[model samples]
Target: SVMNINQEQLLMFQAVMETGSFSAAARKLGKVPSAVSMSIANLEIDLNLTLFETPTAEARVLYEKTAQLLIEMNQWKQHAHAL
Candidate 1:
């Protein structure tokens, strides 16, 4: 299945993943922490893929699984671009 990640959600995901905290991501996005959290949650629902298994209100991505997935996806995109 294709994953359709939106601009805000994708940026939020990237920010949190890079910074390892929603607060940091929120800071980077110039949004409230709650807004950052909600965008990710909303994006997850839209994609039908749980970005985080047990996402908490304050917690953000700290596991390699999601990071690995994102990395693999980027490589996949690169490969596709090479074609």
Candidate 2:
């Protein structure tokens, strides 16, 4: 399906994903946590995709995966430095 996701939505999602918490994302965006959640909810309504998942299930899985990749990349950099 075609999505009309905008920059703000994308940025919010990125912030939340990077920070691993809505409150942290809000701090980065200079907004409140509730505002961040509301924006994401609106984005989900617009795109029909859940950007943030529930806590009891697959919640934070995407963010964790991304964090893992970042960890691996940093390890690679350290390994290269030691080479």
Candidate 3:
């Protein structure tokens, strides 16, 4: 199936996860906070799940796991760029 998510979305997601706020994430990404927020909102729409909340322990764990995946993917991208 075609994926709605893309590399930029993953980067934005990772930025927000690391920075702990949309504004901070946007600053890191050189984008407006609203843009960063809307990107994730669009991702949520594609996934049909709300990713902005972690109301339970399991949800928090899953969010962290997803963040880690994005981080690793970014590392791979950096490595590829350096190659």
Which candidate ranks first by lDDT, i.e. highest?
Answer: 3
Please give the RMSD of candidate 2 to the true structure: 6.5
Worst 10 residues of 2 by lDDT: 53-62
TM-score of each predicted structure versus truth: 0.55, 0.55, 0.65
lDDT of 3 by residue, 1-83 (tens): 11877767767776776788889899999998888988888767766666677233443564687778877887999999999
- Which pairs clash (backbone N, Cα, C closer than 3 Å) in model 3? none
lDDT of 1: 0.70
Error of 2 at 63 (Å): 8.8
Candidate 1 residue 30 C-alpha distance from true site, Å: 1.5
* Tens digits of lDDT, candidate 1, 8-83: 6766877776777789889978999998889878876775657665454323543344566667778999999999
Candidate 1 vs 3: which has more TM-score:
3
How far residue 63's Cα lies from its native spot in candidate 3, in Å, is 4.8
**Candidate 2 C-alpha lDDT tens digits along 1-83:** 22565556656766876778889999999988887898778766775656654332333564465456566777999999999
lDDT of 3 at 48: 68
**Residue 27, candidate 2: C-alpha displacement in angstroms:** 0.8
